[PDB]
A paper describes a structure:
[name] activity is enhanced by prostaglandin E2 (PGE2) and transforming growth factor beta (TGFβ), immune modulators commonly present in the tumor microenvironment. Therefore, its pharmacological inhibition is an attractive immuno-oncology concept for inducing therapeutic T-cell responses in cancer patients. Through its proline-rich domain, [name] binds to a diversity of adaptors in hematopoietic cells, including those involved in T-cell receptor (TCR), B-cell receptor, and cytokine-induced signaling. The function of [name] has been studied most extensively in the context of T-cell activation.
However, the overall kinase selectivity of this molecule, in addition to its stability profile, revealed significant challenges. Not only did 12 show instability under basic conditions due to the known lability of trifluoromethyl groups at the C3 position of azaindoles, but the oxazine moiety also displayed rapid degradation under acidic conditions. In addition to challenges with hydrolytic stability, 12 also displayed plasma instability. Most problematic though were cardiovascular toxicities driven by residual ROCK2 activity that were observed in an in vivo rat telemetry study, where 12 produced a dose-dependent decrease in mean arterial blood pressure (MAP) after a single dose (10, 15, 30% reduction compared to baseline in MAP at 15, 30, and 60 mg/kg of 12 respectively). With these parameters in mind, a further campaign was initiated with the goal of improving both the stability and the kinase selectivity profile of 12.
Numbering used by the authors: 7 to 157, 170 to 294
Amino acid sequence: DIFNRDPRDHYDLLQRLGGGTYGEVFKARDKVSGDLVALKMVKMEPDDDVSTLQKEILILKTCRHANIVAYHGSYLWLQKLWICMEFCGAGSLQDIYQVTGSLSELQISYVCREVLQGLAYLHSQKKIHRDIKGANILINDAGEVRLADFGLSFIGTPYWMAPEVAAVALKGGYNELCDIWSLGITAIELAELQPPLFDVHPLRVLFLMTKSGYQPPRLKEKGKWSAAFHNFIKVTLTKSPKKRPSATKMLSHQLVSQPGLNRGLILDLLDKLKNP
Ligand SMILES: OC[C@]1(F)CN=C(Nc2cc(F)c(Oc3ccnc4[nH]cc(C(F)(F)F)c34)c(F)c2)OC1
């Protein structure tokens, strides 16, 4: 459901957060709640069809889980769409680790369980995130973890595309289990400050993956991590999606099911951020 009103009534905008990849996102206080919200402002061109986004907004609203950024309500007004969202004060894990350096085996483990909690719920709703990485895992001042979900014309013009071709332009080859893979890369990203093959051209990384011989990547330093963290990487990055375990199966992995995993590990992290 979309509300048709100036949202500058309801909310005072307190600080501009957004930059390159996030675009325009504002920290804002709710005039009624007195509560803190993130307002993501979307720019809309005349020939941008509104009715097509209303289909992508349902998905955001009926996504109700602690481990997913809560949707509050969209606002169309003056050729702009403002999406109101749970605020996460520490921004993304990427913002964090670029200052704090590498995350610890136990820090990464709690992040891997909270994410799986969110993916396991998404999947149960037959939804697929498509973009698990550091930049899309957000952190609140409590040190709790929240998956940011978001929601091309030069893939071709569709008018001539045959239907099977059009089926892929919307769906990609994406599968619920492709989100699991991305977590494995993300875990390495948290460990190493960059995903495998960051120093390699993207096209080449795409070719290399589609070679028959392609080898799932690994943690650089053997001794630095437990057998558990090693096995978590091995299993999440299984090549064949037919054999890659689901998010519930992964929640019963020893790396994420161990005790002592909780938000303190991150509060540590958020302290490390204040006091270098
Ligand atoms: O281009 C990258 C930079 F220049 C360097 N760092 C950032 N950090 C950054 C900036 C933002 F605006 C972010 O968005 C939020 C911030 C707080 N609470 C949020 N709740 C939901 C969101 C989101 F809109 F879904 F993302 C959100 C964010 F998560 C991180 O972006 C600038």
